[PDB]
Amino acid sequence: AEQVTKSVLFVCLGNICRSPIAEAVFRKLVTDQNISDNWVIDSGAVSDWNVGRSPDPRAVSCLRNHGINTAHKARQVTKEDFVTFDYILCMDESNLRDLNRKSNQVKNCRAKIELLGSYDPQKQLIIEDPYYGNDADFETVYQQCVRCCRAFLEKVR
């Protein structure tokens, strides 16, 4: 009868370009289904170099062109973001190396840590890559970030 405001938080080194797309996406997914009033999704950089580094001019006009709604600052995830959110996942990249051992030093951590995987489909597709360069490839990543939060919103629907 009473729905709950589920909470999720994506994380991944370099929150600029190929990364912050799955985040702004989870928003467009929670804002198109009377589901935005029941979710606490946020982004997580995990570093202190991209703290406040808005998306690059390349991934900024893209997510802000098809309709993604991006009104949040990367900022470096903190114990508050951990215990706060409950679904702290990441774009694979560093196979749960830090975030996994991050809740260990978190003052009372409660953010289940994990990395995107097979949700809607059933194939083993993981983002075990450092980057894709910059030219000759960019819109493909933003597209892979669509289900990054939607395909996952199905399990925590």
Swiss-Prot record:
Q: What is the effect of changing residue 62 to S?
A: 2.5-fold increase in activity
Effect of mutating residue 72 to E: Decreased activity
Which reactions does this protein catalyse? O-phospho-L-tyrosyl-[protein] + H2O = L-tyrosyl-[protein] + phosphate; a phosphate monoester + H2O = an alcohol + phosphate
Residue list for modification N-acetylalanine: 1
Where's it found, cell-wise?
Cytoplasm
The UniProt entry lists the main location of this chain as cytoplasm
Which InterPro entries does the annotation name?
LMW_PTPase (IPR050438), Ptyr_pPase (IPR023485), Ptyr_pPase_sf (IPR036196), Tyr_Pase_low_mol_wt_mml (IPR002115), Tyr_phospatase_low_mol_wt (IPR017867)
Q: Alphabetically list the UniProt keywords.
A: Acetylation, Cytoplasm, Hydrolase, Phosphoprotein, Protein phosphatase
As for PTM, the annotation reads: Phosphorylated by LCK. Phosphorylation at Tyr-131 increases its phosphatase activity.
Q: Which residues does UniProt mark as catalytic?
A: 12, 18, 129
Q: Which SUPFAM superfamilies does the entry link to?
A: Phosphotyrosine protein phosphatases I
Please indicate which superkingdom the organism of origin belongs to.
Eukaryota
In the UniProt record, which is one GO cellular component term?
A: cytoplasm
GO terms for MF: acid phosphatase activity; non-membrane spanning protein tyrosine phosphatase activity; protein tyrosine phosphatase activity
In this UniProt entry, the residues modified to Phosphotyrosine are: 131-132
What Enzyme Commission number(s) does the record list for this chain? 3.1.3.48, 3.1.3.2
> Zinc: present as a keyword of the record?
no
Query: Could you describe the subunit structure of this protein?
Result: Interacts with EPHA2; dephosphorylates EPHA2. Interacts with EPHB1. Interacts with the SH3 domain of SPTAN1.
Q: What is this protein called?
A: Low molecular weight phosphotyrosine protein phosphatase
Q: Which organism is it from?
A: Bos taurus (Bovine)
Query: What is the name of the gene encoding this protein?
Result: ACP1
